[PDB]
Design a protein around this ligand. Structure first.
Ligand code: AGS
Ligand code: AGS
Ligand code: ADP
Ligand code: MG
Ligand code: MG
Lengths: 258, 258, 159, 335, 327, 340, 254
């Protein structure tokens, strides 16, 4: 148990301040608690991380609920914080003094005596930002591939239209169950059109042979469209099993054409 | 196969010094009558073109042309092991994934051997040289370097103007303007210092100083530099080698074009 | 910690005794009031008043040093009627050359450090002040923006 | 496929005859041509019409284009990598492929580039930051004899007034359902599709809302499910994100609580993480929430007001989920 | 020659007797310099009040005509960092004068744009070297200065120029130039100044250029209003009356014809109507709240552009709906 | 030389072809050009700050002034033009602008002093000063205050609020007025006659009416109408309907349909009609402006309704001026005005 | 007008090398008896003063003095075209907006000509040199450079102390202290290596090492350096030229 020297010289972990922002002590004046919390938020200088902590915690916190309006009032503050944070890169940081007020709105609105347990937290945003960057880089690479092959397609394809319209249909076409098609000629014609589409988008079939002793090196599409299109974890498993048989048939047809 | 042995590694090192910085990728091709190499910068305003005949080598054998592309930076990184006096042999098979540089001292003693990874570049050698240019002139290359180094300080553009018996280099920018005027003359006390000029038509072209600065490097390969100008094509600056030459073709600025 | 009134008064009395300066009780009171626990600022204001007028009187101290800025801003924000706050802002702050940025920023500080009113109304007043601060930073800083900020603060205080 | 059957000239256009005639009039004299801004709904065919107009201003080699790369250095050592679509008569830049570094690429590339002129196609001009637009403001006027801009956008709302004034404005109205049906007819007769009844094509138009790019893609997607033979009751193929948004609205109108707000935030995160813009998400969510017959006019008015407010918030913010969750919570509080 | 400088630069005060408006601070500074006790000065005030002119004339009176050599004048145009402080300011304070014997003067003009680290390094330079040099900090906003640096200097607030001093300077300019000015024109000129001598000098030069004559005539209110593009009180009150009493369509037509006959701006009309309605003794403050809020919103929207007709109709409707609560 | 310039101007769009080269070509901004012409004979040009709506002629006015002052020879040696397409941070303002200001004026030639006044100062203009950060702007304060003897500063902007108060006080404020039909009909008729633009009686005045104080957009619309009338080759005159068709103006009947749907109709019918109307590409700003004109001009609505319609249109325009979705904003506006 | 031709462009290049770095603006003035130039650094602790008599030139013509100010950096940027052996001619009219530098090789061959933009500087030449200094000393300039280069490493301040027959340079800082002690001496084997000292009063002054470092550059113009110190004024370090001199006046510390 070592903490005395910490109370002596160290501040309040931003996590401890977030858990304190959702706690009300019934034995102290609400105004004194508010000024103590304001001083702790100001001394920390990291108002953004405290607010992101408050944003991740508030849905799991117990708060006397009438119609979940409290959340509607806080979306307007959070929007005010985002405008203020954008303006900090444009203007000399005079606006930084108001950044400590937004976390204190959580204490006013959601602070309750019921919140005795510390809720642990994480950083979904850094993971979402890195994932959004990776997905944007994949999409930027597909858009470059279209620009090099499809001379006209590139003029009609916006980044948003590519993500929401073109890629989901392209993936649905590749993942379609060819085993239901009894007509061999029609199966061959569809496979020739799909090989032409894979060529127009420059989608390479790579045999991932990274399989420890298990006799099925899964075929993967490069770039992996699957990571951009497949939002639903249930659909990922169904699509992976169907694709494995289709991709082997498509690879054999690409090799035949080569 | 490629098998070219330079008497002195120094010659190859100076040649590569010429491609250095101004271009990133170089495409070499060895054949029965020698080695050629071409490199174009990203903006496509400068082409560096080399030709080394069979006689420039101490030993050259070619029964099957080989084309190979490589990163210039990687090559120069390796091109400081020649001791200048070392012997250098370039070696490659008919379908290479690498180029071998073999430096050896006279005695069996020390053998530095490198295996440089190659890049795949679509073979597309340009043949933009003209039959006749509006004007042709040669002068000591050290003199040309000084002329370029003077004017460069004043502007990002250096104009070359030619009229009967007159060659004039001019730069004009923020701090002021400058000019260097030279006149044709035959020095019998040593003709390597003469300044020749053959004008079929007066010319007046502007070039980006950054590019002329890249070009002056050729001084290290030849005492004189030949400059051929035309209003119909890129200008040619040429540095002769014993059996060969290093050429720089530079597109005039349109008004803003390097 | 801050220096109480007694300590700064004693130090100023010692300095006056050591310098043989003509003073009065109200002048020293105004000096200590404008010092706000700042001994260095107190001695500087005393020396400036002495070298500028000779007699340390409240009139001289007030004419050579304006009243504590935050106090007029607090009296403006704590006004009960809109016209009183508007007249205070016009005469005391705007007609004397105080920039709008200083007025709004001093305004934010006063509110943050206010204790007369509750927490929620203080947060709403800070929100309105900060919206005015936003408008002002964009170059729209005029008297109309501060008047609208005061009107919104009064509307919040208007139940 | 959309790309296999696309017009390449002005005489190959098959809808908006008045717009084709206006383009022919504007391309009659090509040298005294001011800058152009094509605006209208997304999927109408403005990017095809701009290339068709270039095909009238220049030779047929305008479509033979190539993709190159250009590197830029910002105030720091972060290297900006941008690919360029270039042609022997024009070039295309899309500043929507990066963050706040649109101004650097715009100014430097256009200054380097600046019949007798070389056309420039700025794709998705709505993503151009205000600083990049301000930088382009004077570049549009200083070099008017060598560089002509053809800016393709879907809404002139984020475009500043100076840029709007500095170029002609050409509106591209979405084609009528009849023209879409006639185009789908030629496509299915050329692609050898089997239609039991023609009216299904009309329904495709009624499911596309004027979008031809979406119409042809959906027709081809449902032609693969029916095995190249469309019947009288072939199901309509809807994108996955639209189904997710519809399920989200069902969850909204069914349950209004914080526990449901958590799963709503989770669905919003899963939608945003898969390259789906938040403005389109908000638009579709609001439009499909207004379609809920359980609500009344009092609820729909508040919903549209909150959607406009939070659309302004999202256009003024950067953390899109911070506004999306707020709008969802306000809608939950309204219902 | 001085005949080529603009009127703002040509009429810059060179002595402390040419700085009008500021009397309580000018006399105190003169006494500080005559008696010898000149502390560290902090001239805080709005632009165009005469802080730079005051300190320049003060340094001239202190050191003579060689002011440009015995004084270290730094401003925002020059690089003012922490290293710049450490080297230049400390070497200036620690050393002595090369031209005469006496204390030094460091004029940190526009020091509100200095870095926090620079002020933190300078606050100990002011306290250490205080027997051979002095510090003068000029500021427009007192919030950009650290409280430590703000407490080491004696603060002087430059009030806006009053009517008497600005009229005295106008008379001095009318004496120096072959120019005549109407009394009502002079009053209108003082009204559109807000205590800014720069604006007065600029518009005086501009209306002298507008005269088109060899200056045998006078400058009336029409010249000033047409040159500065400012609305007249007559048209202002006419628009306000037509908005308050007349019909909606008639009010719209009146506003349109007024703003299109003289090319007036909607923002100037907004500010004028705000200034006029400030004297209106009104009923319950709800009308004032609504009026101020809506007018500030419309002004902030105009500050970013939009449709001028829509904004004018918005102003009309806002004023009307605000006054509808007064009944 | 000059003939190449004439041909390049003749092969240039009408916006750049008819750019004012002298101070007399300015048609409506007379108050500013009068002072600029008077100071041309004197030598006391002050620091200037041009501000106003876009397309009023600020850049053209300053270019014509600099030309009439320095001649086509000193036009390229005594001018420092900085636009928004260049870097204008603190570093640039401190190094380049200050080095150019501290430099001495270039010597005029013998041909310059014989035809042009050749003032003893140079001109540094900063176009589109709205993008300049406030610290880089405050850095210009003493730079323009101390070196005023050798250089003169000309700021150009659209929003005068984006420039800090000290800079706005140091420079003489020149407000450029909107170019409506009254003060620009002469220039529009001159442009039409110089290009043989055969139009009807009320076309030009209508064009500026669509321009809303913008001569550049009016000249562009006139050029488009002339091209569309020359392609047809019918030899007839341009009509106001043909002009408002290509100007993005919604036809009167389509607007009357919107008025009927707003007056009579529920949320569902209004939403369906808005979804149908958004299929045909129309700018929401123009629709809002036309609705405002119709509602405020029509003498058939109550004043209480008029205050509310004006405030709602103001809010809708303020929201649309931020890059929002046109469909959502238009639907919200129509729904809010339907509840009235 | 200005018309001054240097035999070797090198002399002018070395002279400008002396103003280089330590000052930004230089004010030149040509007249009937030659050319003078003065430059003061921003902190005003260093004055660089030049004098070149008519005889230092191969050709000099002046019927009307001309004063011209310029940016030192711009000048040096242009001052590397002299080939050192090139001939250099400075040219300017009576009311110049520019200064022309004309470099020519013996033969008509190559002519590099520059037109440098001038700055307007209020003419205000200082005349701070003293009649008598407390102490005067001269020694080889390369020796002075070494002395300065040694001590500089130890501190930002180098003290010069003079007592009868003793000159002592001292630096004391973080890593420790250092000192260089030299004594007057006449070397007949070559008197350009002698160290002279005339002391009327012992002196002890401190200078900023950064400035002494700027000053040592004069070694390239003269074999010896003269140092004159006083407790009443800036110290004078002087480098003689054939008909002329380059002087550095440096204000002592506190
Ligand atoms: N009190 C005054 N008396 C006479 N002229 C004045 C006065 N104040 C300002 N002026 C005029 O206005 C010009 C500018 O004055 P400055 O002192 O530069 O303004 P300022 O008070 O320093 O405010 P800044 O520089 O924007 S922070 C002077 O050159 C005078 O022509
Ligand atoms: N007063 C005018 N008289 C004649 N032509 C004008 C006038 N104002 C604008 N124009 C025309 O409009 C063109 C554009 O002029 P500009 O000076 O660039 O407009 P602007 O005020 O700079 O708008 P910006 O740059 O968006 S703030 C000119 O080349 C003229 O053809
Ligand atoms: N004139 C035309 N006739 C028939 N189909 C067309 C025509 N113009 C475009 N299309 C097709 O209609 C769809 C329009 O979507 P898209 O091309 O993305 O629009 P945009 O050109 O605006 O980007 C595409 O399938 C396109 O090929
Ligand atoms: Mg000042
Ligand atoms: Mg402009």
């Amino acid at each position: 148990n070592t903490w005395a020297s910490s109370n002596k010289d160290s501040p309040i972990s931003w996590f401890k301040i977030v858990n304190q922002l959702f706690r009300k002590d019934p034995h102290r004046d609400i105004k004194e608690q508010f000024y103590e919390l304001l001083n702790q938020v100001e001394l920390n200088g990291n108002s953004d991380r405290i607010l992101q902590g408050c944003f991740n915690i508030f849905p799991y916190v117990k708060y006397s609920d009438n119609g979940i309006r409290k959340p509607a009032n806080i979306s307007d503050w959070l929007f005010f914080h985002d405008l203020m944070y954008q303006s900090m890169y444009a203007h000399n940081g005079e606006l930084l003094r108001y950044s400590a007020l937004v976390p204190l709105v959580f204490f006013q609105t959601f602070g309750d005596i019921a919140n005795k347990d510390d809720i642990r937290m994480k950083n979904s945003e850094y993971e979402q930002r890195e994932l959004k960057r990776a997905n944007s880089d994949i999409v930027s690479l597909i858009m470059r591939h279209i620009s090099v092959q499809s001379p006209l397609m590139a003029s009609f394809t916006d980044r948003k239209s590519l993500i929401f319209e073109i890629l989901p249909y392209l993936d649905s076409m590749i993942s379609s169950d060819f085993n239901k098609i009894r007509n061999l000629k029609l199966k061959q014609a569809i496979m020739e059109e799909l090989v032409q589409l894979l060529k127009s988008f420059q989608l390479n079939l790579i045999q991932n042979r990274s399989e420890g002793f298990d006799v099925r090196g899964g075929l993967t599409i490069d770039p992996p469209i699957d990571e951009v299109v497949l939002l639903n974890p249930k659909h990922i498993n169904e699509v992976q099993h169907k694709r494995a048989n289709n991709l082997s048939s498509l690879l054999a047809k690409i090799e035949e054409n080569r | 196969m490629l098998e070219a042995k330079f008497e002195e590694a120094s010659l190859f090192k100076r040649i590569i010094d010429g491609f250095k910085d101004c271009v990133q990728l170089v495409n070499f091709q060895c054949k029965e009558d020698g080695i050629i190499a071409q490199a174009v910068d990203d903006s496509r305003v400068l082409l560096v073109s080399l030709e080394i005949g069979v006689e420039a080598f101490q030993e050259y054998r070619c029964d099957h042309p080989v084309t190979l592309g490589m990163d210039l930076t990687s090559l120069s990184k390796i091109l400081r092991c020649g001791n200048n006096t070392d012997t250098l042999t370039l070696i490659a098979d008919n379908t290479p994934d690498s180029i071998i540089l073999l430096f050896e001292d006279t005695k069996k003693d020390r053998i530095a051997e490198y295996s440089l990874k190659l890049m795949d570049i679509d073979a597309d050698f340009l043949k933009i040289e003209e039959l006749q240019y509006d004007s042709t002139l040669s002068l000591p290359s050290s003199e040309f370097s000084k002329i370029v180094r003077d004017l460069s300080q004043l502007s990002d553009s250096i104009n070359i103007m030619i009229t009967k018996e007159t060659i004039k280099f001019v730069a004009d920018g923020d701090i002021g303007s400058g000019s260097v005027i030279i006149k044709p003359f035959v020095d019998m006390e040593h003709p390597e210092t003469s300044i020749k000029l053959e004008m079929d038509q007066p010319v007046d072209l502007t070039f980006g100083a950054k590019y002329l600065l890249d070009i002056i490097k050729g001084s290290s390969l030849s005492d004189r530099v030949g400059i051929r100008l035309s209003s119909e094509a890129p200008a040619l600056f040429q540095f002769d080698l014993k059996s060969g030459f290093l050429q720089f073709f530079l597109a005039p600025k349109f008004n803003d074009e390097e | 910690s801050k220096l109480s009134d007694e300590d700064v008064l004693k130090r100023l009395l010692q300095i006056i005794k050591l310098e043989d300066v003509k003073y009065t009780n109200d002048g020293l009171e105004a000096i200590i009031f404008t010092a706000e626990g700042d001994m260095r600022q107190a001695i500087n204001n005393l020396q400036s008043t002495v070298a500028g007028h000779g007699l340390v009187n409240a009139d001289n101290v007030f004419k050579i040093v304006d009243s504590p800025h935050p106090l007029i801003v607090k009296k403006m924000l704590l006004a009960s009627n809109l016209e009183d706050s508007i007249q205070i802002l016009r005469t005391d702050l705007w007609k004397k050359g105080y920039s709008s940025i200083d007025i709004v920023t001093t305004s934010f500080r006063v509110t943050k450090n206010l204790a007369q009113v509750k927490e929620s109304v203080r947060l709403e007043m800070i929100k309105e002040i900060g919206l005015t601060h936003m408008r002002i930073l964009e170059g729209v800083g005029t008297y109309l923006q501060l008047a609208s900020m005061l009107a919104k603060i009064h509307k919040l205080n208007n139940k | 496929w959309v790309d296999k059957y696309r017009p390449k000239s002005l005489n190959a256009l098959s809808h908006n005859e008045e717009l084709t005639n206006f383009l022919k009039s504007l391309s009659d004299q090509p040298r005294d041509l001011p800058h152009l801004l094509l605006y209208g709904p997304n999927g109408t065919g403005k990017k095809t019409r701009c290339m068709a107009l270039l095909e009238s201003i220049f030779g047929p080699g305008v479509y033979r284009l190539k993709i190159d790369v250009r590197q830029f250095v910002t105030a720091s050592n972060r290297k900006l990598e941008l690919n360029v679509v270039s042609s022997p008569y024009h070039l295309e830049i899309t500043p929507s492929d990066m963050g706040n570094n649109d101004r650097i690429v715009i100014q430097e590339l256009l200054k380097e580039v600046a019949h007798r002129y070389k056309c420039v196609i700025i794709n998705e001009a709505n993503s151009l930051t205000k600083d990049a637009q301000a930088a382009l403001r004077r570049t549009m006027e200083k070099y008017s004899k060598n560089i002509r801009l053809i800016m393709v956008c879907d809404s002139m709302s984020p475009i500043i007034a100076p840029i709007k004034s500095r170029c002609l404005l050409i509106r591209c109205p979405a084609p009528s359902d009849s023209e879409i049906s006639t185009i789908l007819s030629d496509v299915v007769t050329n692609e050898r599709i089997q239609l039991e009844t023609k009216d299904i094509l009309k329904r495709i138009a009624q499911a596309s809302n004027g979008n031809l790019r979406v119409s042809l893609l959906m027709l081809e997607s449902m032609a693969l499910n029916n095995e190249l033979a469309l019947k009288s009751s072939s199901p309509i193929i809807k994108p996955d994100w639209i189904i997710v948004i519809h399920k989200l609205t069902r969850k909204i109108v069914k349950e209004r609580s914080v526990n449901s707000l958590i799963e709503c935030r989770a669905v919003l995160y899963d939608l945003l993480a898969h390259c789906i813009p938040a403005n389109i998400i908000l638009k579709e969510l609001t439009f499909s929430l207004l379609d809920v017959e359980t609500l009344n006019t009092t609820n729909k008015s508040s919903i549209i007001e909150y959607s406009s407010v939070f659309d302004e918030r999202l256009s003024l913010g950067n953390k899109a989920i911070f506004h999306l969750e707020g709008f969802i919570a306000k809608v939950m509080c309204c219902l | 020659s001085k005949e080529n400088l603009p009127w703002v630069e040509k009429y810059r005060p060179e002595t402390l007797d040419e700085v009008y408006g500021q009397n309580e601070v000018i006399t105190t500074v003169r006494k500080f310099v005559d008696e010898g006790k000149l502390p560290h000065l902090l001239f805080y005030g709005p632009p165009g009040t005469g802080k730079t002119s005051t300190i320049v004339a003060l340094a001239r009176e202190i050191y003579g005509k060689n002011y440009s050599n015995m004084v270290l004048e730094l401003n925002a145009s020059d690089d003012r960092g922490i290293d710049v402080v450490r080297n230049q300011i400390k070497d200036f304070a620690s050393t002595r004068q090369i031209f005469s014997k006496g204390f030094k003067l460091i004029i940190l003009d526009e020091a509100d744009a200095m870095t926090n680290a620079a002020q933190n390094a300078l606050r100990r330079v002011i306290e250490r070297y205080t027997k051979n040099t002095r510090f003068c900090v000029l500021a427009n906003y007192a919030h950009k200065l650290t409280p430590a640096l703000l407490s080491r200097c004696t603060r002087f607030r430059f009030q806006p120029l009053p009517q008497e001093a600005i009229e005295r300077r106008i008379a001095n300019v009318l004496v120096h130039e072959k120019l005549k000015l109407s009394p009502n024109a002079e009053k209108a000129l003082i009204e559109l100044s807000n205590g800014d001598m720069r604006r007065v000098l600029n518009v005086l030069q501009s209306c002298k250029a507008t005269l088109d004559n060899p200056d045998e005539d006078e400058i009336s209110d029409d010249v000033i209003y047409e040159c500065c593009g400012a609305p007249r009180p007559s048209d202002l009150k006419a628009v306000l009356k037509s908005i308050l009493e007349d019909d909606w369509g008639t009010a719209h037509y009146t506003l349109n014809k007024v703003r299109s006959a003289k090319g007036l701006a909607l923002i100037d009309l907004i500010e004028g109507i705000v200034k006029i309605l400030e004297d209106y003794e009104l009923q319950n403050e709800e009308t004032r709240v609504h009026l101020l809020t809506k007018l500030a919103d419309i002004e902030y929207s105009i500050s970013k552009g939009g449709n001028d007709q829509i904004q004018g109709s918005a102003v009309i409707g806002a004023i009307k709906a605000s006054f509808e609560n007064e009944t | 030389s000059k003939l190449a310039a004439e041909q390049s101007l003749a092969q240039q769009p009408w916006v750049e072809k008819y750019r004012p080269k002298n101070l007399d070509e300015v048609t409506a901004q007379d108050h500013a050009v009068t002072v600029l012409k008077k100071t041309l004979k004197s030598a006391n040009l002050p620091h200037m700050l041009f501000y106003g709506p876009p397309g009023t002629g600020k850049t053209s006015t300053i270019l014509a002034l600099t030309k009439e002052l320095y001649g086509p020879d000193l036009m390229k040696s005594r001018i420092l033009e900085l636009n928004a397409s260049d870097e204008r941070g603190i570093s640039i303002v401190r190094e380049k602008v200050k080095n150019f200001a501290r430099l001495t004026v270039s010597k005029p030639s013998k041909h310059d002093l014989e035809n042009y006044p050749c003032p003893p100062y140079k001109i540094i203009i900063l176009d589109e000063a709205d993008s300049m950060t406030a610290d880089a702007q405050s850095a210009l304060r003493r730079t323009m205050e101390t070196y005023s003897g050798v250089t003169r500063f000309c700021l150009i902007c659209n929003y005068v609020t984006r420039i800090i108060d000290p800079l706005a006080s140091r420079c003489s404020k020149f407000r450029f007025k909107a170019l409506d039909a009254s003060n620009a009909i002469d220039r529009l008729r001159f442009i039409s006659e110089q290009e043989n633009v055969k139009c009807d009686d009320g076309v030009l005045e209508r064009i500026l009416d669509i321009s809303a104080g913008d001569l550049r957009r009016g000249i562009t619309l006139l050029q488009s109408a002339s091209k569309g009338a020359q392609y047809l080759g019918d030899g007839k005159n341009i009509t106001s309907t043909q002009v408002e068709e290509l100007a993005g103006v919604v036809p009167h009947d389509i607007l009357i349909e919107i008025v009927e749907k707003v007056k009579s109709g529920d949320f569902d019918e209004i939403k369906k009609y808005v979804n149908t109307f958004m299929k045909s590409g129309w700018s929401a700003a123009s629709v809002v402006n036309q609705l405002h004109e119709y509602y405020i001009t029509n003498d058939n609505f109550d004043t209480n309704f008029k205050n509310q319609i004006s405030w709602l249109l103001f809010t809708t325009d303020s929201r649309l001026n931020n890059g929002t979705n046109e469909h959502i904003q238009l639907l919200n506006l129509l729904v809010k005005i339907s509840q009235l």
